[PDB]
């Protein structure tokens, strides 16, 4: 499936993922698309902080969902 990642600056990124992909695999996809190392980024969905070990289905992220890239700790 395809998902979106938005930044505070308005930018939207599109990613091809599977539901068994971990959050860490998603961060590495963002790295390949934007040059942001996985350690320097957090992800948000429905106001929840995602953990690297969990999967997209562990959070019920389905097709065309929108995550938010957070670039401040």
């Amino acid at each position: 499936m395809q998902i979106f990642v938005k930044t505070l600056t308005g930018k939207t990124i599109t990613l091809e993922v599977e539901p068994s992909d971990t959050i860490e695999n998603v961060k590495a996809k963002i790295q390949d698309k934007e040059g942001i190392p996985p350690d320097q980024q957090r992800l948000i969905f429905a106001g929840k902080q995602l953990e690297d070990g969990r999967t997209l289905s562990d959070y019920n992220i389905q097709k065309e969902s929108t995550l938010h890239l957070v670039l401040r700790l």
Binding site: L8, T9, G10, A28, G35, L71
Partner: protein, 384 residues
Amino acid sequence: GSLESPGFMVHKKLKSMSQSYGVMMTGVPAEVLGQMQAERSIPSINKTGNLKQQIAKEVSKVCHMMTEPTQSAGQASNDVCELLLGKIEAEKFHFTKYEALSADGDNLKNVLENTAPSSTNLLIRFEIDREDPPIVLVKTKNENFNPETAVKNKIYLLENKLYFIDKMGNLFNLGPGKKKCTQLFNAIGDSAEYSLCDPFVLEEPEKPEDFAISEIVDIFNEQKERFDFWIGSHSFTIYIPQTLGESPRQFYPYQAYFGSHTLQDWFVSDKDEYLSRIGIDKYIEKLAVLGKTTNTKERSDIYAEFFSKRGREAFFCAHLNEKRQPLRVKFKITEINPELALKNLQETQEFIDTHPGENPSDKVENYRNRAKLAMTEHLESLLD
């Protein structure tokens, strides 16, 4: 008293504007920021509660996340690249492949010695990876083990196999035969998950379970080379402007660091100038040691000296923050057109000047208040 080069004027303007204006350097209207943060924060608001008060509680809590400049080292490198290259050439630079810094860093030095200091303006972007090996061993029955659904980045001990599933899902047979695996499987207890990095079992084994886990750790270490544990960890840039005449070549490092500081804090602290004073050769040499050493203290010290918030070098990579895993330094290099970079900086200053206010502080405060008001308004609109 001649004039500095255009290439050096890029550094001076980038440093000065970033000190003064901060978060405004992105060139993104405050309204965009506020609306995006409203969209991030709308789930936290309970629609049956007090709406006005929940909105003001949310706005005053996530203010800094909005109106402070990024701490992402990656986003900071992107910002620098876009200012100095422009959007198009920065996209082409991003799809350029990273090179590994050699053991003594002579490949970077060699590139630098074949460009005349007077003829070019260089931008170098670095990425540091850290090893993140598996830390858990799972003892499971073969009948309960399906590689397609098993959790990734773990070592798995079955009755008859020893497998490693890496971060991406690759299945590696680690090699021991069935009798060895029967030995290891039955030497270990019934807790299911065991640690691969517990110094009390690895250095003070007292029961066969400890010795079996230790044998597994050794089997894994002896073939580490088959695997890829690298994960992208840090990012930064070095700018080398052209010199004029016989003047020696200077370099300036730029970075942000997650949970530590912004590019603006970096410039305000003048750590760019401080590291500049050691010279590019010394800098590359210590980068190469960082990527090559097996010693934790040496690794931690170089990392702290180079990447810490100024004034925290003594604590940055100490104790819990020690750098206990190997690191890998990668780089890519491109030429800078200083005319274009100065135009992007002037266009950003024109953006900044559209904000009412007399001193930089006043325009920054206009920007922040606009972001807060746009977020309050967009939340009010989303809640109808």
